[PDB]
Coordinates of N, CA and C in Angstrom, one line a residue:
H1 N -8.0 -20.3 -11.2 CA -7.6 -18.7 -10.9 C -7.3 -18.3 -10.0
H2 N -7.9 -19.2 -8.6 CA -9.4 -19.7 -8.7 C -10.6 -18.5 -8.8
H3 N -10.6 -17.9 -7.5 CA -10.0 -18.3 -6.7 C -11.2 -19.2 -5.4
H4 N -11.7 -19.5 -5.7 CA -13.6 -20.4 -4.6 C -12.6 -21.8 -4.2
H5 N -12.4 -23.0 -4.5 CA -12.2 -23.4 -4.0 C -10.8 -23.4 -2.4
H6 N -11.5 -22.5 -1.1 CA -11.1 -22.9 0.0 C -12.1 -23.8 0.8
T7 N -11.4 -24.7 1.0 CA -12.2 -25.6 2.5 C -12.8 -24.7 3.3
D8 N -12.4 -23.7 3.8 CA -13.0 -22.8 4.2 C -13.5 -20.9 3.3
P9 N -14.4 -21.5 3.9 CA -15.5 -20.4 3.4 C -15.4 -18.9 3.6
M10 N -14.8 -18.9 4.4 CA -14.6 -17.1 5.0 C -13.7 -17.2 3.6
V11 N -12.5 -17.5 3.6 CA -11.5 -17.3 2.2 C -11.9 -17.2 0.6
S12 N -13.0 -17.6 0.5 CA -13.9 -18.3 -0.7 C -14.1 -17.0 -1.2
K13 N -15.3 -16.1 0.4 CA -15.8 -15.1 0.3 C -14.8 -13.8 -0.9
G14 N -13.7 -14.1 0.1 CA -12.8 -12.8 0.0 C -12.2 -13.2 -1.6
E15 N -11.5 -14.3 -1.6 CA -10.9 -14.5 -2.9 C -11.7 -14.2 -4.2
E16 N -13.9 -14.9 -4.3 CA -14.0 -14.6 -5.1 C -14.1 -13.4 -5.6
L17 N -14.1 -12.2 -4.1 CA -14.0 -10.6 -5.0 C -12.8 -10.2 -5.8
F18 N -11.3 -11.1 -5.4 CA -10.7 -10.8 -5.7 C -10.2 -11.6 -7.1
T19 N -10.6 -12.3 -8.0 CA -10.5 -13.1 -9.0 C -10.5 -12.0 -10.4
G20 N -9.3 -12.4 -10.6 CA -10.2 -11.6 -12.1 C -9.3 -10.4 -11.8
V21 N -9.2 -9.5 -13.0 CA -8.9 -8.0 -12.9 C -9.1 -7.2 -12.3
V22 N -9.1 -6.5 -11.5 CA -10.2 -5.7 -10.8 C -9.8 -4.1 -11.0
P23 N -11.1 -3.5 -11.4 CA -10.5 -1.5 -11.6 C -10.2 -1.0 -10.2
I24 N -9.3 -0.2 -10.2 CA -8.9 0.5 -9.1 C -8.8 2.0 -9.1
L25 N -9.7 3.0 -8.2 CA -9.6 4.4 -8.5 C -8.8 4.9 -6.9
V26 N -7.7 5.2 -6.9 CA -7.6 6.0 -5.8 C -7.5 7.6 -6.0
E27 N -8.1 8.3 -4.4 CA -8.3 9.5 -4.9 C -7.6 10.1 -3.1
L28 N -6.2 11.2 -3.6 CA -6.0 11.8 -2.9 C -6.3 12.6 -2.5
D29 N -6.4 13.6 -0.9 CA -6.1 15.3 -1.1 C -5.6 15.7 0.0
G30 N -4.4 16.1 -0.3 CA -3.6 16.7 0.5 C -2.7 18.0 1.3
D31 N -2.3 18.1 2.6 CA -2.0 19.1 3.0 C -0.1 19.1 3.2
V32 N 0.0 19.6 2.6 CA 1.9 19.5 3.2 C 2.6 20.8 3.2
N33 N 2.8 21.0 4.6 CA 3.4 22.7 5.3 C 2.4 23.4 4.5
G34 N 0.8 23.4 4.0 CA 0.3 24.7 3.6 C -0.2 24.4 2.0
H35 N 0.5 23.7 1.4 CA 0.6 24.0 -0.3 C -0.2 22.4 -0.4
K36 N -1.7 22.8 -0.8 CA -2.7 21.8 -1.0 C -2.3 21.3 -2.7
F37 N -2.7 19.8 -2.2 CA -2.7 18.6 -3.7 C -3.6 18.3 -3.7
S38 N -3.7 17.5 -5.2 CA -4.8 16.8 -5.0 C -3.9 15.2 -6.3
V39 N -4.3 14.1 -6.2 CA -3.9 13.1 -7.0 C -5.1 12.3 -7.2
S40 N -5.2 11.9 -8.2 CA -6.0 11.0 -8.9 C -5.6 9.9 -9.0
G41 N -5.7 8.6 -9.3 CA -5.3 7.4 -10.4 C -6.3 6.8 -10.9
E42 N -5.4 6.0 -11.1 CA -6.2 5.3 -12.6 C -5.9 3.5 -13.0
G43 N -6.1 2.5 -12.6 CA -5.4 0.9 -12.9 C -5.8 0.1 -13.1
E44 N -5.5 -1.1 -12.4 CA -6.3 -2.5 -11.9 C -5.2 -3.0 -11.0
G45 N -5.8 -4.0 -10.7 CA -4.8 -5.1 -9.7 C -5.0 -6.7 -10.0
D46 N -4.9 -7.6 -10.2 CA -4.8 -9.0 -10.2 C -3.6 -9.8 -9.7
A47 N -4.6 -9.7 -8.0 CA -3.9 -10.2 -6.8 C -3.3 -11.4 -6.4
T48 N -4.1 -12.3 -7.7 CA -3.2 -13.9 -8.5 C -1.6 -13.3 -8.4
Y49 N -1.5 -12.6 -9.1 CA 0.2 -12.2 -9.2 C 0.7 -11.3 -8.8
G50 N 0.3 -10.9 -7.4 CA 0.2 -9.8 -6.0 C 0.4 -8.3 -7.1
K51 N 0.2 -7.9 -8.3 CA 0.3 -7.2 -9.4 C -0.6 -6.0 -9.8
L52 N -0.4 -4.6 -9.6 CA -1.1 -3.9 -9.5 C 0.1 -3.0 -10.7
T53 N -1.4 -2.0 -11.5 CA -0.9 -1.1 -12.6 C -1.7 0.0 -12.5
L54 N -0.9 1.3 -12.0 CA -1.0 2.3 -12.2 C -1.3 3.5 -12.0
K55 N -1.6 4.9 -12.9 CA -1.1 6.0 -12.8 C -1.9 7.2 -12.0
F56 N -1.2 8.1 -11.8 CA -1.3 8.8 -11.1 C -1.3 10.3 -11.4
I57 N -1.9 10.5 -11.2 CA -2.2 12.4 -11.8 C -2.6 13.1 -10.5
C58 N -1.2 14.8 -11.1 CA -1.7 15.4 -9.7 C -2.5 16.6 -10.4
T59 N -3.8 16.1 -10.0 CA -4.5 17.0 -10.9 C -5.1 18.9 -10.7
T60 N -3.4 19.1 -9.4 CA -4.1 20.3 -9.0 C -2.4 21.4 -9.3
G61 N -2.2 20.6 -10.9 CA -0.8 21.2 -11.2 C 0.6 20.5 -10.4
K62 N 1.7 21.4 -10.0 CA 3.0 20.2 -9.7 C 2.8 19.8 -8.2
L63 N 2.8 18.7 -8.5 CA 2.5 18.1 -7.0 C 4.4 18.6 -5.7
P64 N 3.5 18.8 -4.6 CA 4.7 19.8 -3.8 C 5.8 19.3 -3.6
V65 N 4.9 17.1 -4.0 CA 5.9 17.0 -2.6 C 6.7 15.6 -4.2
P66 N 7.8 14.7 -4.0 CA 7.9 13.9 -4.6 C 7.9 13.1 -4.7
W67 N 7.2 12.2 -6.0 CA 6.6 11.2 -6.2 C 6.5 9.5 -5.0
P68 N 7.7 9.5 -5.0 CA 8.1 8.6 -4.5 C 7.2 8.3 -3.0
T69 N 7.8 9.2 -2.1 CA 7.1 9.5 -1.2 C 6.0 9.2 -0.9
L70 N 5.1 8.9 -1.7 CA 3.5 9.0 -1.7 C 2.9 7.7 -2.5
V71 N 4.1 6.2 -2.9 CA 3.4 5.0 -3.0 C 2.8 4.3 -1.8
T72 N 4.0 4.6 -0.5 CA 3.3 3.6 0.5 C 1.8 3.9 0.3
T73 N 0.9 5.0 0.6 CA 0.2 5.8 0.7 C -0.5 5.1 -0.1
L74 N -1.0 6.1 -1.4 CA -1.2 6.1 -3.1 C -1.9 3.9 -3.3
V76 N -3.0 -0.3 -1.8 CA -4.2 -1.2 -1.7 C -3.7 -2.7 -1.2
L77 N -3.0 -3.3 0.3 CA -2.6 -4.2 0.3 C -4.2 -5.2 0.2
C78 N -5.1 -5.2 -0.5 CA -5.8 -5.9 -0.8 C -5.1 -6.9 -2.0
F79 N -4.9 -6.2 -2.7 CA -4.5 -6.9 -4.1 C -2.8 -7.8 -4.0
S80 N -2.0 -8.0 -2.5 CA -1.0 -8.7 -2.7 C -1.1 -10.5 -2.3
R81 N 0.1 -10.7 -3.2 CA -0.5 -12.4 -2.7 C -0.5 -13.0 -2.0
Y82 N -0.7 -13.6 -1.6 CA -1.0 -14.5 -0.5 C -1.2 -16.4 -0.8
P83 N -0.2 -16.3 -0.8 CA -0.1 -18.0 -0.7 C -1.2 -19.0 0.0
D84 N -1.6 -19.8 -1.0 CA -2.8 -20.5 -0.7 C -2.5 -21.3 0.9
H85 N -1.0 -21.8 1.6 CA -0.9 -21.7 2.7 C -0.8 -21.0 3.6
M86 N -1.3 -19.7 3.5 CA -1.2 -18.2 4.3 C -2.8 -17.7 4.1
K87 N -3.3 -18.0 3.1 CA -5.1 -17.0 2.8 C -5.3 -17.6 3.9
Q88 N -5.4 -18.2 5.0 CA -6.1 -17.8 6.1 C -5.7 -16.8 7.0
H89 N -4.2 -16.2 6.7 CA -3.8 -15.2 7.1 C -4.7 -13.4 6.4
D90 N -4.6 -13.7 5.2 CA -4.9 -12.1 4.6 C -6.6 -11.4 5.5
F91 N -6.1 -10.9 5.7 CA -7.0 -9.3 6.8 C -7.4 -8.5 5.3
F92 N -6.0 -8.2 4.6 CA -6.8 -8.0 3.5 C -8.6 -8.1 2.9
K93 N -8.2 -9.3 2.1 CA -9.7 -9.3 1.8 C -10.2 -9.3 2.5
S94 N -10.1 -10.1 3.6 CA -11.3 -10.6 4.9 C -12.8 -9.2 5.3
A95 N -12.1 -8.2 5.0 CA -12.5 -7.5 5.7 C -13.6 -6.5 4.0
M96 N -13.4 -7.2 2.7 CA -13.8 -6.6 1.7 C -16.0 -7.2 1.9
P97 N -16.8 -7.1 1.1 CA -16.1 -5.5 0.2 C -16.6 -4.5 0.6
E98 N -17.0 -4.5 2.6 CA -17.4 -3.0 3.2 C -15.8 -2.7 3.0
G99 N -15.0 -3.2 3.6 CA -13.3 -2.5 3.7 C -13.3 -2.1 5.0
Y100 N -11.6 -1.3 4.6 CA -11.1 -1.3 6.2 C -10.1 0.4 5.9
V101 N -10.0 0.7 7.0 CA -9.1 2.0 6.8 C -7.7 1.3 7.7
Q102 N -6.5 2.5 6.3 CA -6.3 1.8 6.5 C -5.3 3.6 6.9
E103 N -4.5 3.4 8.1 CA -4.0 5.6 9.5 C -2.7 5.2 9.5
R104 N -1.8 6.3 8.5 CA -0.4 5.8 9.1 C -0.2 7.1 9.5
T105 N 1.4 6.9 10.1 CA 2.2 7.9 10.3 C 3.8 7.7 9.6
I106 N 4.2 9.1 9.0 CA 5.0 9.0 8.2 C 6.5 9.7 8.3
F107 N 7.2 8.8 9.6 CA 8.4 10.5 9.6 C 9.6 10.5 8.9
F108 N 9.8 11.5 8.0 CA 10.8 12.3 7.7 C 12.1 11.8 8.1
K109 N 13.3 11.3 8.7 CA 13.7 11.7 9.6 C 15.0 12.4 9.3
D110 N 14.7 14.1 10.2 CA 15.3 15.2 10.2 C 14.7 16.0 9.7
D111 N 13.6 15.7 9.1 CA 12.7 16.1 8.5 C 11.3 16.4 9.2
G112 N 10.2 17.2 8.2 CA 8.6 16.7 8.8 C 7.6 15.1 8.7
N113 N 6.2 15.3 8.8 CA 5.8 14.3 9.1 C 4.5 13.9 8.2
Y114 N 4.3 12.7 7.2 CA 2.9 12.8 7.4 C 2.0 12.1 7.4
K115 N 0.5 13.0 8.2 CA -0.3 11.6 8.6 C -1.5 11.4 7.5
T116 N -1.7 10.1 7.5 CA -2.9 9.8 6.6 C -3.8 8.8 7.0
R117 N -5.3 8.9 6.4 CA -6.3 8.2 6.6 C -6.9 8.1 5.2
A118 N -7.3 6.0 5.0 CA -7.5 6.0 4.1 C -8.8 5.5 4.4
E119 N -9.5 5.1 3.6 CA -10.9 3.8 3.1 C -10.8 3.6 2.3
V120 N -10.4 2.2 2.0 CA -10.3 1.4 1.1 C -11.8 0.5 0.3
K121 N -12.9 0.4 0.4 CA -13.4 -0.3 -0.3 C -13.7 -0.8 -1.6
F122 N -15.1 -1.4 -2.3 CA -15.4 -1.4 -3.2 C -16.2 -0.9 -4.1
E123 N -16.6 0.0 -4.3 CA -18.1 0.6 -5.2 C -18.6 -0.2 -6.2
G124 N -19.2 -0.8 -5.8 CA -19.8 -1.8 -7.1 C -18.9 -2.2 -7.6
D125 N -18.0 -2.1 -8.6 CA -17.4 -3.8 -9.2 C -15.4 -3.0 -9.1
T126 N -15.8 -1.5 -8.6 CA -13.8 -1.1 -8.4 C -13.5 -0.7 -7.4
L127 N -12.5 -1.2 -6.7 CA -11.8 -0.8 -5.8 C -10.9 0.5 -5.2
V128 N -11.4 0.9 -4.4 CA -11.3 2.3 -4.4 C -10.8 2.4 -2.7
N129 N -9.5 3.2 -2.9 CA -9.2 3.9 -2.1 C -9.1 5.6 -1.7
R130 N -9.5 5.6 -1.3 CA -9.5 7.4 -0.7 C -8.8 8.1 0.8
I131 N -7.9 8.9 0.4 CA -6.8 9.7 1.2 C -7.0 10.9 1.3
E132 N -7.2 10.7 2.3 CA -6.3 12.1 3.2 C -5.3 12.3 3.8
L133 N -4.3 13.2 3.5 CA -2.6 12.9 3.9 C -2.1 14.7 4.7
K134 N -1.8 14.5 5.6 CA -1.5 16.0 6.3 C -0.2 16.1 6.8
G135 N 0.6 17.0 6.8 CA 2.0 16.6 6.5 C 2.3 18.1 6.7
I136 N 3.2 18.2 8.0 CA 3.9 19.6 9.3 C 5.1 19.4 9.4
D137 N 5.8 20.1 10.0 CA 7.5 20.1 10.4 C 7.8 19.8 9.0
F138 N 8.0 19.9 7.6 CA 8.5 20.0 6.9 C 9.8 21.1 6.4
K139 N 11.4 20.9 5.7 CA 11.6 22.3 5.5 C 11.7 22.5 4.4
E140 N 11.4 23.5 4.0 CA 11.0 23.8 2.9 C 11.5 24.0 1.7
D141 N 13.4 24.1 1.8 CA 14.0 23.6 1.2 C 14.5 22.1 1.0
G142 N 14.5 21.0 2.1 CA 15.2 20.5 2.7 C 14.3 19.2 1.7
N143 N 14.4 17.7 1.7 CA 14.4 16.5 0.3 C 13.3 16.3 0.1
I144 N 12.3 17.1 0.5 CA 11.0 16.3 0.2 C 10.5 17.7 -0.9
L145 N 10.3 18.7 -0.2 CA 9.8 19.6 0.2 C 10.7 20.6 -1.0
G146 N 12.4 20.2 -1.4 CA 13.2 20.9 -2.1 C 13.2 19.8 -3.6
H147 N 12.7 19.2 -3.4 CA 12.5 17.7 -4.9 C 14.0 16.7 -4.9
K148 N 15.0 17.0 -3.3 CA 15.7 15.8 -3.8 C 16.1 14.3 -4.2
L149 N 15.1 14.2 -4.2 CA 14.9 12.3 -3.9 C 15.0 11.7 -5.4
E150 N 15.4 11.5 -5.8 CA 15.5 10.0 -7.0 C 14.1 9.3 -7.1
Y151 N 14.1 9.8 -8.9 CA 12.8 8.6 -9.2 C 12.9 7.6 -9.4
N152 N 12.9 6.5 -8.2 CA 12.5 4.5 -7.8 C 12.7 4.3 -6.3
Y153 N 12.7 3.2 -6.6 CA 11.4 3.0 -5.0 C 12.5 1.5 -5.4
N154 N 13.1 1.1 -3.5 CA 13.9 0.7 -3.8 C 13.4 -1.3 -3.1
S155 N 13.3 -2.2 -3.5 CA 12.8 -3.5 -2.7 C 12.7 -3.8 -2.0
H156 N 11.9 -4.3 -0.3 CA 12.4 -4.1 0.9 C 10.8 -4.8 1.3
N157 N 11.4 -5.3 2.2 CA 10.5 -6.7 3.1 C 9.6 -6.0 4.7
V158 N 8.4 -6.2 4.8 CA 7.3 -5.8 5.3 C 6.6 -6.4 6.1
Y159 N 7.2 -6.4 8.1 CA 6.3 -7.0 8.8 C 4.9 -6.5 9.3
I160 N 3.9 -7.7 9.4 CA 2.8 -7.5 9.8 C 2.6 -8.5 10.9
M161 N 1.3 -7.8 11.8 CA 1.1 -8.5 13.2 C 0.2 -8.1 14.0
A162 N -1.1 -9.7 13.7 CA -2.5 -8.5 15.0 C -2.5 -7.4 15.4
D163 N -3.8 -7.0 15.3 CA -3.4 -6.0 16.6 C -5.4 -7.0 17.2
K164 N -5.0 -7.2 18.0 CA -6.4 -8.4 18.0 C -7.3 -7.5 19.2
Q165 N -7.1 -6.4 19.8 CA -8.0 -5.6 20.8 C -8.6 -4.3 19.8
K166 N -8.4 -4.4 18.3 CA -8.7 -3.5 17.5 C -9.4 -3.8 16.1
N167 N -9.3 -5.7 16.1 CA -10.0 -6.2 15.8 C -8.7 -5.8 13.8
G168 N -8.2 -6.1 14.2 CA -7.0 -5.7 12.6 C -5.8 -5.7 12.3
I169 N -4.7 -5.3 12.4 CA -3.3 -5.1 12.1 C -2.9 -4.6 13.0
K170 N -1.2 -4.7 12.6 CA -0.1 -3.5 12.7 C 0.4 -3.4 12.1
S171 N 1.1 -2.1 11.7 CA 2.6 -2.7 10.9 C 3.4 -1.8 11.2
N172 N 4.7 -1.4 11.8 CA 6.6 -0.6 11.3 C 7.4 -0.8 10.6
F173 N 7.6 -0.3 10.0 CA 8.5 -0.5 9.3 C 9.6 0.5 8.3
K174 N 11.1 0.5 7.7 CA 11.0 1.5 7.0 C 11.6 1.4 5.9
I175 N 11.7 2.6 5.2 CA 11.4 2.9 3.6 C 12.9 3.4 3.9
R176 N 13.6 3.0 2.8 CA 14.6 4.1 2.7 C 13.9 4.8 0.8
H177 N 14.5 6.0 0.8 CA 14.3 6.6 -0.4 C 16.2 7.0 -1.0
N178 N 15.8 7.8 -2.3 CA 17.2 8.1 -2.3 C 17.6 9.1 -2.6
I179 N 18.6 9.8 -2.3 CA 18.7 11.6 -2.2 C 19.9 11.4 -3.5
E180 N 19.1 12.6 -4.0 CA 20.3 12.5 -5.7 C 21.3 13.0 -5.4
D181 N 22.1 13.2 -4.1 CA 23.3 13.2 -4.0 C 24.4 11.3 -3.6
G182 N 23.3 10.8 -3.8 CA 24.0 9.4 -3.1 C 22.9 8.6 -2.4
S183 N 22.4 9.7 -0.7 CA 22.7 9.7 0.1 C 21.5 8.8 0.6
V184 N 20.5 8.6 1.5 CA 19.5 8.2 1.8 C 18.6 8.4 2.8
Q185 N 16.7 9.1 2.3 CA 16.3 10.2 3.4 C 15.2 8.8 3.6
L186 N 15.5 8.5 4.3 CA 14.6 7.5 5.5 C 13.3 8.1 6.2
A187 N 12.1 7.4 5.8 CA 11.1 7.3 5.6 C 10.5 6.2 6.7
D188 N 10.7 6.8 7.9 CA 9.7 5.5 9.0 C 8.5 5.4 9.4
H189 N 7.5 4.5 8.7 CA 6.3 4.2 8.8 C 5.4 3.5 10.1
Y190 N 4.7 3.7 10.4 CA 3.6 3.0 11.5 C 2.4 2.9 11.1
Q191 N 1.9 2.0 10.8 CA 0.9 1.7 10.1 C -0.7 1.1 11.1
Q192 N -1.6 0.8 11.0 CA -2.8 0.5 11.5 C -3.8 0.1 10.7
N193 N -4.3 -0.8 10.5 CA -5.5 -0.7 9.3 C -6.6 -1.5 10.3
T194 N -7.6 -1.5 10.8 CA -9.5 -1.5 10.9 C -10.3 -1.9 9.4
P195 N -11.0 -2.8 10.6 CA -12.1 -3.4 9.3 C -13.8 -2.1 9.9
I196 N -13.8 -2.2 8.7 CA -15.0 -0.9 8.6 C -16.2 -1.4 8.8
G197 N -16.5 -2.5 8.2 CA -18.4 -3.4 8.6 C -17.6 -4.1 10.6
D198 N -18.6 -4.1 11.5 CA -18.9 -5.3 12.4 C -18.9 -6.9 12.3
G199 N -18.7 -7.2 10.3 CA -18.1 -8.3 10.7 C -17.0 -8.8 11.1
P200 N -16.9 -10.4 11.1 CA -15.5 -11.7 10.8 C -15.0 -10.9 9.8
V201 N -13.6 -11.0 10.2 CA -12.4 -10.2 10.1 C -11.4 -11.9 9.9
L202 N -10.7 -12.0 9.5 CA -9.0 -13.1 9.7 C -7.8 -12.4 10.1
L203 N -7.9 -13.0 11.5 CA -6.4 -11.9 12.4 C -5.4 -12.5 11.7
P204 N -4.4 -12.3 11.3 CA -3.0 -12.7 10.6 C -2.3 -12.9 11.9
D205 N -1.6 -14.9 11.6 CA 0.3 -14.5 12.3 C 0.7 -13.8 12.2
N206 N 2.2 -13.6 12.6 CA 2.7 -12.2 12.1 C 3.2 -13.5 10.9
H207 N 3.9 -12.7 9.7 CA 4.4 -13.1 8.8 C 5.3 -10.8 8.5
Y208 N 5.1 -11.7 6.6 CA 5.9 -10.2 6.3 C 5.1 -10.7 4.8
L209 N 4.9 -9.3 4.0 CA 4.8 -8.7 3.0 C 6.6 -8.4 2.0
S210 N 6.5 -8.2 1.3 CA 7.5 -8.7 -0.2 C 7.5 -7.1 -0.7
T211 N 7.9 -6.8 -0.7 CA 7.3 -5.5 -2.3 C 8.8 -5.5 -3.5
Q212 N 7.7 -5.1 -4.5 CA 8.9 -4.2 -5.4 C 8.2 -3.5 -6.6
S213 N 8.7 -2.3 -6.8 CA 7.7 -1.3 -7.1 C 8.6 -0.4 -8.3
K214 N 8.4 -0.6 -9.8 CA 8.9 0.2 -11.0 C 8.0 1.3 -11.0
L215 N 9.3 2.6 -11.2 CA 8.2 3.9 -11.4 C 9.3 4.5 -12.7
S216 N 8.6 4.6 -13.4 CA 7.9 5.4 -14.5 C 7.3 6.4 -15.0
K217 N 7.0 7.3 -16.3 CA 6.0 8.0 -17.0 C 5.5 7.9 -18.9
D218 N 4.8 8.6 -18.9 CA 3.9 8.4 -19.6 C 4.4 9.2 -20.5
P219 N 5.0 9.0 -22.0 CA 5.5 10.3 -22.7 C 4.6 11.4 -23.7
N220 N 2.8 11.0 -23.5 CA 2.3 11.3 -23.6 C 1.7 12.4 -22.4
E221 N 2.1 12.6 -21.9 CA 1.6 13.2 -20.3 C 2.0 14.0 -20.1
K222 N 1.5 15.3 -19.8 CA 1.9 16.8 -20.1 C 1.8 16.8 -18.3
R223 N 0.5 16.3 -17.6 CA 0.4 16.5 -16.3 C 1.4 15.8 -15.2
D224 N 1.8 16.6 -14.0 CA 2.9 15.5 -13.5 C 2.2 14.6 -12.7
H225 N 3.3 13.5 -13.3 CA 1.8 11.9 -12.8 C 3.3 10.5 -12.4
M226 N 2.3 10.0 -12.3 CA 4.0 8.8 -11.4 C 2.8 7.2 -12.7
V227 N 3.3 6.2 -13.2 CA 3.2 5.0 -13.2 C 3.8 4.3 -13.0
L228 N 2.7 3.6 -12.4 CA 3.7 2.4 -11.2 C 3.5 0.9 -11.6
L229 N 4.2 0.1 -11.1 CA 4.4 -1.0 -11.2 C 4.3 -1.7 -10.6
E230 N 3.7 -2.7 -9.6 CA 4.1 -2.8 -7.8 C 3.7 -4.5 -8.0
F231 N 4.0 -5.5 -6.8 CA 4.0 -6.3 -6.7 C 4.1 -6.6 -5.2
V232 N 3.2 -7.3 -4.7 CA 3.9 -7.5 -3.2 C 3.5 -8.7 -3.0
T233 N 3.7 -9.3 -2.1 CA 3.9 -10.5 -2.2 C 3.8 -11.8 -0.7
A234 N 3.4 -12.4 0.0 CA 2.7 -12.5 1.6 C 4.0 -14.1 2.0
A235 N 4.5 -13.6 2.7 CA 5.5 -14.7 3.0 C 5.7 -15.3 4.7
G236 N 6.8 -15.8 5.1 CA 7.5 -16.1 6.8 C 6.6 -17.1 7.3
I237 N 5.6 -17.7 6.5 CA 5.1 -18.4 7.3 C 5.2 -19.7 6.6
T238 N 5.7 -20.9 6.8 CA 6.2 -22.0 6.5 C 4.8 -23.3 6.5
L239 N 5.0 -24.2 5.3 CA 4.0 -25.1 5.9 C 6.0 -26.3 5.7
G240 N 5.3 -27.2 6.8 CA 4.4 -28.6 7.1 C 4.0 -29.1 5.7
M241 N 4.1 -30.2 6.4 CA 4.2 -31.3 7.3 C 5.3 -31.6 7.7
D242 N 6.9 -31.1 7.4 CA 7.8 -32.3 7.3 C 9.2 -31.2 7.3
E243 N 9.1 -30.3 6.6 CA 7.9 -30.3 5.3 C 7.7 -30.9 4.3
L244 N 6.8 -31.0 3.1 CA 6.3 -31.8 2.0 C 8.0 -32.0 1.4
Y245 N 8.5 -31.9 1.9 CA 9.9 -31.8 0.4 C 11.3 -32.8 1.5
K246 N 11.2 -33.2 2.6 CA 12.2 -33.4 3.6 C 11.9 -35.6 3.0

């Protein structure tokens, strides 16, 4: 499965936390242009397959932004890192003490989200606790006016070390689909730093490939999102000629 047999006992440590299926809890407090809301999510992750199954509920009533815009905010430690890349998995190496994930998300010709989250274990549960603040949105625009399709395009994201902060940085573009066929750009700037003073794995340049399916629970009356998300790491070659010349 496995995830223990690596020559590197540091890799062994992190992988052992992510053997098997791990329960996940997500909590978000949000405030966008003064529209306050809370989201709770539950489900499970299987990092061997880079696989997340999560259901999110807006516990304060109607969500005042479109669900797709919160996908990246609402646990990269469940990404599948190839065996030959496991020395580059920052996210698992920061566990169980965890890491801070901070972003600014710029919606082109509209407002911005600023997010701070702490991702860590509480017992056997991987917890993602988030604060989100949104300002400068158009109250009748694509976000506050709910003009986005309920879907999520597949995309690739580059990850780099931020060696001076003992963590990583990443910037990438999300393109949300507008209901008229156009696109709403959401430009992401991201940084992650460990919560402990313990050692972490700082990665060589690489990327994560993502795909997400969004659906609804037909017996759920609350405003909600069902997410099936896969994240896989790539972009570093083996070696040694390769193995297949």
